[PDB]
């Protein structure tokens, strides 16, 4: 949902208050990616154990 | 209805077109030189003619 995937690009274009809006979208989405990864690793670990 | 501990009032006078440059995140001949509010600034801005 962010304008661009690069962090420095958003920081180097939008103003400080506008950038935080776009940076939060990257942090939120990337955070969900880790949750998906860890969730799958825990499940797969159960199959290996 | 809601009260605060310490109240700080900065009194001054500026040109008309220089008013919009005083606000969190805003830049200009005011915010970038003499008087600048922080991006996280929490307060009230009052002006009259």
From A14, which residue of chain B is nearest by alpha-carbon distance?
Answer: B25
SS3 content of chain A, % helix, strand, coil (to 5): 80, 0, 20
Q: Do A17 and B27 touch (CB under 8 A)?
A: no
Resolution in A: 3.2
Q: Give the method used.
A: cryo-EM
> Where does residue A11 rank: exposed (0-12), middle (13-18), buried (19+ CB within 10 A)?
middle
Q: CB–CB of B48/B34 below 8 Å?
A: no
Alpha carbon distance A35, A24 (integer Å): 16
**Closest CA relative to residue B23, chosen from B5, B2, B38:** B38
Q: Which residues of B8-32 are buried (b: 16+ CB within 10 A; e: fewer)?
A: eeeeeeeeeeeeebbbbbbeeebbe
Q: CB–CB of A19/A10 below 8 Å?
A: yes
In 10 A of CB B46, how many CB atoms? 6
CA distances A35 to A32, A44, B7, Å, are: 5, 14, 44
């Amino acid at each position: 949902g962010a304008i661009s995937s690069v962090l420095n690009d958003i920081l180097s274009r939008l103003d400080p208050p506008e950038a935080e809006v776009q940076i939060d979208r990257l942090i939120t989405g990337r955070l969900q990616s880790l949750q998906t990864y860890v969730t799958q690793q825990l499940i797969r670990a159960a199959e290996i154990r | 209805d809601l009260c605060f501990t310490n109240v700080y009032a900065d009194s001054f006078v500026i040109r008309g077109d220089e008013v919009r440059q005083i606000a969190p995140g805003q830049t200009g001949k005011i915010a970038d030189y003499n008087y600048k509010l922080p991006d996280d600034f929490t307060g009230c801005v009052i002006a009259w003619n």
